[PDB]
Short mmCIF file of C-alpha atoms in Angstrom, two decimals:
data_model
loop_
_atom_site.label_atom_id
_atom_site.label_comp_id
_atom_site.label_asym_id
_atom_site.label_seq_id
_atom_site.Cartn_x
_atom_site.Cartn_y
_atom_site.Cartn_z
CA UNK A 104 0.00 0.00 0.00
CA UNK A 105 1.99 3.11 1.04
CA UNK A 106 4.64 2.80 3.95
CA UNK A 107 4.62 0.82 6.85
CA UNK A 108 3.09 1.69 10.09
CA UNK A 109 2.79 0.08 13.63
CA UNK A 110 0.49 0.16 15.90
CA UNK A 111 3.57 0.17 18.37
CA UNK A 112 6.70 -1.07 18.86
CA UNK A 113 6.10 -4.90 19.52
CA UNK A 114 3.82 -4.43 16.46
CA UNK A 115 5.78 -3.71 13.86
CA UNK A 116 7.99 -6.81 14.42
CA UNK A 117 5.25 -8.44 12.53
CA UNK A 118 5.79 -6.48 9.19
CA UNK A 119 9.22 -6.33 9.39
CA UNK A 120 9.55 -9.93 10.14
CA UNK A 121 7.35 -10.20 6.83
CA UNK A 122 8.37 -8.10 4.65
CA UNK A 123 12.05 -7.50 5.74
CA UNK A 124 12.57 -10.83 7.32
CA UNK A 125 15.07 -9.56 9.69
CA UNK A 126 13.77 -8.40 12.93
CA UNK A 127 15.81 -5.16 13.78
CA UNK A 128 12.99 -2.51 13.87
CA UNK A 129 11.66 0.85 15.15
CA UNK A 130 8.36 2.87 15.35
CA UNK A 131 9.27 6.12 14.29
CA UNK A 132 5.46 8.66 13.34
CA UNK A 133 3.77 5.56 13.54
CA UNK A 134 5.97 4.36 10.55
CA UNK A 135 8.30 1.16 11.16
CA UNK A 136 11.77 1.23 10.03
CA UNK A 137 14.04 -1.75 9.63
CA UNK A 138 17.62 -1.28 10.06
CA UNK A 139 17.68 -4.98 8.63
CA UNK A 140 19.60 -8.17 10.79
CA UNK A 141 21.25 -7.54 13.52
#
């Protein structure tokens, strides 16, 4: 769609751990943000 938002922190593991696959990730305006693996 457009972006990626959270409804919080513990949240956005979800997408990112879809989309990204790597679970290093931050809530940041409601939008997540991966930083990618560890």
């Amino acid at each position: 769609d457009e972006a990626i938002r959270c409804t919080g922190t513990k949240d956005c593991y979800i997408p990112c751990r879809y989309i990204t696959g790597c679970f290093n990730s931050r809530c940041i305006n409601k939008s997540c943000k991966c930083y990618g693996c560890t």
